[PDB]
Write a protein that binds this ligand. Structure first.
Ligand SMILES: *[C@@H]1O[C@H](CO)[C@@H](O[C@@H]2O[C@H](CO)[C@@H](O[C@@H]3O[C@H](CO[C@H]4O[C@H](CO)[C@@H](O)[C@H](O)[C@@H]4O)[C@@H](O)[C@H](O)[C@@H]3O)[C@H](O)[C@H]2NC(C)=O)[C@H](O)[C@H]1NC(C)=O
Ligand SMILES: *[C@H]1O[C@H](CO)[C@@H](O)[C@H](O)[C@@H]1O
Length: 278
């Protein structure tokens, strides 16, 4: 627990077509999503809640590849480069809904847990409904930015508390979320379903910092140079050969970049999302 993996990078083993699709599904959460029958790649938009002001927009889709896909917006309801003394960045226990499912000493960042907790009843209800409606057993969770950390928590909660568990999770520009205990519990419960994707010089995976007790789960795929198709996998937790070997840029350019031919441009990107356009 709390280590840094020193093993070498390996070729990217992920399904780049699924990553490209997932990227589209989350870009679309930055756009109004109540137009009926909207199609993003292989997927149909079924349902939306939130709006990216009080709560992150969450879209529910049906995909033949990904099943019932839950996509969580990550717009700046709070900012991740602001004063780290703020209560948003404090570690806290798991919420009483699911603390029983986690190891003792698990800690999560208040800001992400709060924001997930405001959506979690509605996510569960809509997922359960559209699984029944579409006779679909697979649940895919997708997030970007703030919504990537919320989405990791959602992914876990689905695996622990929902019938059928989780299929896959695809997370883009994932901030840190929990402590070493949480991150090792992610590896152990959803490690084989976990896909963290980082683009270029993106700074967001470096916050909140490890000196405040935060730790990523094992493995990410890092696209370098930013926006290209050149990418490797950096295995284990907090790989020393990964992203800190190249200087972070302190803007959202690469964060809101091209991930396997699909842009996640955020609020000022493409609406509707266009899978495989770039
Ligand atoms: C990888 O792909 C990314 C696109 O998905 C690239 O990100 C883009 O990078 C450029 C410059 O590096 C950014 O352009 C800047 O935009 C600011 C925004 O403020 C202005 O917003 C409106 C937009 O129309 C404008 O009219 C006003 O003047 C505002 O002031 C400008 O102020 C700057 O001059 C600057 O040009 C893009 O915004 C950014 N796109 C996104 C979606 O974030 C990235 O650079 C690519 N990386 C590599 C390595 O190739
Ligand atoms: C990186 O290097 C360390 C030794 O310094 C090992 O513990 C690890 O297996 C990896 O080779």
């Amino acid at each position: 627990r709390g280590g840094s993996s020193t093993d070498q990078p390996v070729a990217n083993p992920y399904n780049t077509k699924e990553i490209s699709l997932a990227a589209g599904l989350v870009q679309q959460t930055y756009c109004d999503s109540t137009e009926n029958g909207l199609k993003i790649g292989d997927s149909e938009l079924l349902y939306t809640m939130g709006e990216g002001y009080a709560r992150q927009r969450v879209n529910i889709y049906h995909s033949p590849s990904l099943g019932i896909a839950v996509a969580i917006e990550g717009t700046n309801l709070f900012s991740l480069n602001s004063d780290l003394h703020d209560a948003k960045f404090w570690q806290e226990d798991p919420n009483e809904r699911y603390i029983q499912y986690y190891p003792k000493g698990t800690k999560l960042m208040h800001g992400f847990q709060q924001a997930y907790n405001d959506l979690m009843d509605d996510i569960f209800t809509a997922v359960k409904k559209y699984k029944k409606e579409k006779n679909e057993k697979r649940v895919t969770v997708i997030g970007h930015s703030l919504g990537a950390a919320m989405g990791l928590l959602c992914a876990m909660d689905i695996e622990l508390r929902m019938d059928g568990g989780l299929y896959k999770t695809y997370l883009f520009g994932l901030p840190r979320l929990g402590n070493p205990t949480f991150a090792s519990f992610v590896d152990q419960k959803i490690g084989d379903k976990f896909h963290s994707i980082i683009n270029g010089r993106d700074w967001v995976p470096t916050v909140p910092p490890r000196a405040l007790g935060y730790q990523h789960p094992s493995d990410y795929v890092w696209i370098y140079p930013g926006n290209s198709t050149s990418a490797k996998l950096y295995p284990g937790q907090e790989n020393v050969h990964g992203i800190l070997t190249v200087a972070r840029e302190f803007n959202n350019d690469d964060h809101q970049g091209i991930y396997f031919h699909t842009q996640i441009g955020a609020v000022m990107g493409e609406c509707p999302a266009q899978v495989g356009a770039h």
